[PDB]
Ligand SMILES: Nc1ncnc2c1ncn2[C@@H]1O[C@H](COP(=O)(O)OP(=O)(O)O)[C@@H](O)[C@H]1O
């Protein structure tokens with residue numbers, strides 16, 4: 001039972017915030033993207049490219065379930081995990097922190113040479129806004145807490161999370 005589950009588009013800060021957040025709570029960080037790659041011995045890009053997204057979502061869903069059952073620290077889901085309904089159902093009852101980012105900032109923060117099957121040029125920004133439109137509702141439905149990561153330098157993001165995790169709502 002993770003202390004917290006982080007959800008958000010790529011660029012929202014799931015590894016930046018999830019590392020600072022897991023240290024602060026004195027527990028480990030688990031990223032389901034890396035967990036997929038450790039389970040399968042394959043890169044994320046190879047699974048998309050070779051087996052298709054539908055088969056990727058199935059490994060993901062099973063990895064997420066396994067992490068929700070097993071992990072006691074901070075768990076960050078890959079950006080599209082929430083599109084699988086059985087991920088959304090497994091998330092019920094958990095502490096879910098939606099990292100909210102704008103398009104322009106998400107795009108800016110994701111502009112390096114990381115391989116992203118669903119977020120490649122040209123028109124990468126237009127893709128990101130399609131991902132947002134599609135997924136923002138899904139993140140809102142599963143989240144038990146929403147945090148703007150736009151301006152906030154990370155340590156302030158984390159501080160906000162901690163004090164919100166401690167008090168009732
Ligand atoms: N609160 C923040 N402020 C500024 N930059 C951030 C913040 N959170 C993450 N970043 C930066 O944005 C990029 C994407 O970070 P990452 O944490 O991997 O996002 P995700 O893991 O959701 O894709 C990194 O270069 C990181 O330094």
Ligand SMILES: O=C(O)C1=C[C@]2(O)C=CCO[C@H](C1)[C@@H]2O
Nearest residue numbers: 010033044078079080116117118
């Ligand atoms: O937003 C996505 O669908 C994905 C985001 C990632 O977390 C990031 C990089 C590679 O693409 C897939 C799928 C990963 O799960």
